[PDB]
Amino acid sequence: YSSANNCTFEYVSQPFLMDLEGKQGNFKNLREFVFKNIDGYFKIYSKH
Amino acid sequence: AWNRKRISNCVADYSVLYNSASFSTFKCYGVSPTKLNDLCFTNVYADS
């Protein structure tokens, strides 16, 4: 991004950790997300 | 050249406004300043 002017919400979620390998292989894991917006409030869901 | 600010996604209060503050004039229009607690606003600005 270039910059930001006027941010009405900011945010950091819960801590967690990631592997960050530089190798090659089959996808050992899976990630799912359902982004949605209902009645003016954003929401997200997930599973590993 | 007053300063316009944004109060968003937090909880305000009134009881922390006068205990030793002793300001010049505290008043509110269309609602008693005493019951700021029960009332529930949206997208509060701050100009000073």
């Binding site: - | 006068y18 002793s22 300001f23 505290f26 005493t34």
Partner: protein, 48 residues
């Protein structure tokens, strides 16, 4: 015409077909005014 008074303030609301005549300076919580009319002291009577 300054003979017409309307109540500036009251502790609570009124009742169907109710009248109040007596008068005290509005006082909030502690530090009772006793006619001082300083911070947190306000005059109940109002003039047109």
């Amino acid at each position: 015409n300054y003979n017409y008074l309307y109540r500036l303030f009251r502790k609570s609301n009124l009742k169907p077909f109710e009248r109040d005549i007596s008068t005290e300076i509005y006082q909030a919580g502690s530090t009772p005014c006793n006619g001082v009319e300083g911070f947190n002291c306000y005059f109940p009577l109002q003039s047109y």
